[model samples]
Target: NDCPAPPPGSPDIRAIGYYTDAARSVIDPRLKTQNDAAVKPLNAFAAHVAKFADAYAKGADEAAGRCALTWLDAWARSGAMLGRMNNDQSDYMRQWTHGAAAMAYLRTQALASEQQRTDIETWLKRLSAANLAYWDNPKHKRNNHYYWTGVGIMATAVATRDDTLLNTAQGIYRAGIDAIEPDGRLPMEMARKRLALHYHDYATAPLVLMAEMARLQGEDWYTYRQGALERLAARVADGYRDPSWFNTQSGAVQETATPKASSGWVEFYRLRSPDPMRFDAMHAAGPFQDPRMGGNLTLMAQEGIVPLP
Candidate 1:
């Protein structure tokens, strides 16, 4: 509770929903400034919300956990971030943060009292219903977007212990794994051309999160689809060492990996994979935390850092 006030740049959290994707050009999309007007603030807000989880996870600080619940509970009571969307694009922003909030919940839930847990979980389930409605459709590309939605709903499902929603996420995860080609490439993500490797990396993040949760539930989902998920992870892991696979496939100069675009999920994946030692070099950058995966994953994935089920 004693942490400094969130910087002014943070998204209102109660406002700032809806924006368009602007990666239409074939060149490095990071130079595209159109989305920055929206995404900059969204990233700031994500960092703000994520710190609560980081605080608790960093050293088992109950005060930070209590503050995390307080912030989320107030948002729930005020119907924050659940505002009417101007369009489907608006919902995309909500979806991005929805899973992150649920992740914040998952990290801090053990410190919650009954009423705090009830209110927060109820709000999350309400978000889950809306998230499912928006994401479970043929309209949205069944690529990284769906996987991110699945992670959001899946995290809520895990946090709230809702089997029904959990099963729904399992279907999403199952379908995603089924879609992986034998070589571990996602044909859909590969379509990004210049950003192909980047998108594939993006897509890998959520699937990894889902598989980890599956492991927490004692379901061997990583090995599902004859270990298709691992192959997908494996291919992307190699893409980091060398992205020539995607370059050869796309016939375009590959976008280089930034921390955000790189293997933020690798640290956690390395720990859980059958071949733990194999990924050390890929994760040499270390302490991988992803905004979409609720941040500070290196802390959460460690044994006893964040409690297991």
Candidate 2:
């Protein structure tokens, strides 16, 4: 992918070519040596921590929960991705979300063995005791509410097997649902000058995930509350065509009306509703490729489980 040689001391003659080279090597195993050489300290930290937790959580062994906890501690030792007050504390919030995700992934392991169940209980007890204060506090809110809170609530519920955890999660979700305008716009994200389409893509995630967890917990989410969620989806669907449907103080340029690509969060809903556009919207948006993207899109697509759409 290299271009003609650049003048001496100049940057790469073709910057995009250099990027493509890096991207390919990072994703392709054949170039691991080159990729490993280039990985920065921060990148290494993320990769190892995420890999360890993911492997352990997805593993079937009784020690899986304990192993995942070890990774969770590694992530905590890594510097914060949640933000400070006023601006986003995304730096720190992200850490919590990742930790929550580890717990959620461990649920599968917990379901399999009595030893895993005990280990998971021990893990949840430590997690809930450690992070409960932050999650419950309103003053520490951030932009990635759905990502952080949804993962926290749902994961805590599943790991602890606690109805209280689920109830709390449902309440928070309800509070968020109530914040949606009747027109179906999320005033919070829109008011922040976020892209209408992107908001639809990002903001809808927690609701969808929560709905699924509710179904699994036997809470009857579809029957419990109706208007806000469904209307929000309809409004978001409308936003694909009419950006104004999402009111925003920040002008449209920075918050482009166009959706980037499909996110797995959208697919989570598609599994419940059999909405054709759900996949189409996601495909147009692009593949939900990252585990950081949340849930398993491959399984969902393969099973064709209808989502809340």
Candidate 3:
């Protein structure tokens, strides 16, 4: 039983966005989350690729690599998500999958066959181009969304060998860093009220990832603005434990939890910190992973962050 063309990429995404207070980003338990229903197929596609990549990264599993290539080839041949965006949600989904797939494919560089490599690489280049086009423009919610865009594009840039994409990601990083106030607050994220602290951690994943990737190419992405990213990092780390700082800042009861998935960013963050033990408690929930971070983030940390291709 071979992989059968995988899932037909979610070409027509119709996400209702949030199930709860759509405006303030509140999570109400009563309503069903329509966004996940619409985007799950796309995420599943990314998940499979990530799974195979994780398998490959563990020990150069060519069989797993072949499966990954097969699925990617199926998607690449049809140019699944290369179409125009149907809505803002569609744009978000496309950029997300682009980042996830590109990062996953980066590891396959050593395993993909020649023809498979050409087809998949070419497709990823197109996806990266689309992501760069959308993110290059101005947006209102230049908070977690912008930071995530940076990580995705930065990963794509590394995979495709495109300096323009890399530059765009770096630009996004710069803008995000500028958004960090002297108190390590991101104005846009703080606007999330109850979820303020949650968004801080959410935004941290991408920015930290971008910073780490830049480290590979001899670029000092971490210590900007006299340690701006670090400022944000410290705030996030502290807030994760006691969000009273965020509660007072947002003027709303801080909504928080310690989901291992969300904490995957910390797996990379601690490695570059002077107080790496600040998050020793979080490590108790071991094996942290994030799909956008190319899955198995703890494993990536163990293997040494995959160098920028």
Q: What is the lDDT of every predicted structure here? A: 0.71, 0.47, 0.75
lDDT tens digits, residues 1-309, model 1? 375443332223332322233433153344335455655655665666678777777664778777777777766666656656523545666777777778778777888889888887888888778777876577766777778878778888877778998998899888788888888889888777778778877888888788787766677676666667677777776777788888898667787765442266776778667776657766667667666677777766675324532
lDDT of 2 at 58: 43
Model 1, residue 300: what's the lDDT? 65
TM-score of 1: 0.85
Residue range 137-240, candidate 2, lDDT tens digits: 67755344544465555656755677776776677677677777676666656644444456555677666666665655556665545766766666665566
By lDDT, the candidates rank as: 3, 1, 2
Candidate that beats the other on lDDT, 1 or 3, i.e. the better one: 3
Task: Identify the runs in model 1 with alpha carbons over 4 angstroms from their true place.
Answer: 1-34, 39-41, 86-88, 258-262, 274-278
Q: Which candidate, 1 or 3, would have the higher TM-score against the true structure?
A: 3
Candidate 3: segments with Cα more than 4 A from true spot:
1-5, 19-23, 28-32, 136-140, 307-309
Worst 10 residues of 1 by lDDT: 10-19
Best by TM-score: 3
Q: How accurate locally is residue 267 in candidate 2, as Cα lDDT from 0 to 100?
A: 54
Worst 10 residues of 2 by lDDT: 8-17
lDDT tens per residue, model 3, 2-38: 3445777644555545435543567544333567777
Clash counts for all predictions: 1, 25, 0
Ranking by TM-score: 3, 1, 2
